[PDB]
């Protein structure tokens, strides 16, 4: 069952076509992707331990053809190892094509392809910001609940060669030990507060010493000193997150102690931002590849 090669083939078939060309997989093929990837997610740790080399990417948000460009410029799997930091759906016009290809690669190369959970991989959020609408339109309500059951098993964070800490949002006032993350059981919803919430929602802030209230109305903001203390305590060099759109696709914080990655250029078509992608080699040297709109 589950013809992975056929699915992937039909998903890659629309390269170079007029931007907007859909890929209508069958309800069963998509449901198969959710269930199989769900196993692999639960089989792997909730706190991924990864090795170089690999490519890190930020938010995609249903911008499917921009995702294909990333793979085109960065190298289609398994020519390159990948780590995505979440927010694959919502706001884009092709969330379905986006998440399906990602899951398809997750199943095809489970040791060379990894997906983190963003704050939009939550039922409470993607019901409103477009993903549920897309499911209702092109399929049915029950397919959406299937995606929900799959998103609840996504890993939350990742550490690359004991030096680079990766998560969608940022840090948490309740994050004292790395075991506090490993102790979280899946499947799980995203609470409106706590460790799991902050890891997917928090933002860095220049004008903040310590922790401050977050503009989003959820979680907190954190300052440069918090990043410094955090990195020193766990013997880490870099924090690699996403969650926020930045002009050049990448943006440094606290003297290059933290980096924000965003991989969706022309976000919502309302921004003029670029998308970036960070490559990390075996010597832990990080380089950026930019996608101009």
């Amino acid at each position: 069952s589950l013809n992975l090669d056929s699915i992937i083939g039909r998903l890659l078939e629309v390269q170079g076509s007029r931007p907007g060309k859909n890929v209508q997989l069958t309800e069963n093929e998509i449901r198969g992707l959710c269930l199989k990837s769900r196993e692999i997610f639960l089989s792997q740790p909730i706190l991924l331990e990864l090795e170089a080399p690999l490519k890190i990417c930020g938010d995609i948000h249903g911008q499917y053809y921009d995702l294909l460009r990333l793979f085109e410029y960065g190298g289609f799997p398994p020519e390159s190892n990948y780590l995505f930091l979440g927010d694959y759906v919502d706001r884009g016009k092709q969330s379905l094509e986006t998440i399906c290809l990602l899951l398809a690669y997750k199943i095809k190369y489970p040791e060379n392809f990894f997906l983190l959970r963003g704050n939009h991989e939550c039922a409470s959020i993607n019901r409103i910001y477009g993903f549920y609408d897309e499911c209702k339109r092109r399929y049915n309500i029950k397919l959406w609940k299937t995606f929900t059951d799959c998103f609840n098993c996504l890993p939350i964070a990742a550490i690359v060669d004991e030096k680079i800490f990766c998560c969608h949002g940022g840090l948490s006032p309740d994050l004292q030990s790395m075991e506090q993350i490993r102790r979280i059981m899946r499947p799980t919803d995203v609470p409106d507060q706590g460790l799991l919430c902050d890891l997917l929602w928090s933002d860095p802030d220049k004008d903040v010493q310590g922790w401050g209230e977050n503009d989003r109305g959820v979680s907190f903001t954190f300052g440069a000193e918090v990043v410094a203390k955090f990195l020193h305590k766990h013997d880490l060099d870099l924090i690699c997150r996403a969650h926020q759109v930045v002009e050049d696709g990448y943006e440094f914080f606290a003297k290059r102690q933290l980096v924000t990655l965003f991989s969706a250029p022309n976000y919502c078509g309302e921004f003029d931002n670029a998308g970036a992608m960070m490559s990390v080699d075996e010597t832990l040297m990080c380089s950026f590849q930019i996608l101009k709109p």
């Binding site: 740790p45 331990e49 990864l50 090795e51 460009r69 290059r256 990080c286 380089s287 590849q289 930019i290």
Partner: peptide, 22 residues
Amino acid sequence: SSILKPPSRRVSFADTIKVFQT
């Protein structure tokens, strides 16, 4: 080749970035 660890080096940043137009 797998890169998932079972359950000395330092981080540097390349001064050159590649820019793709599309």
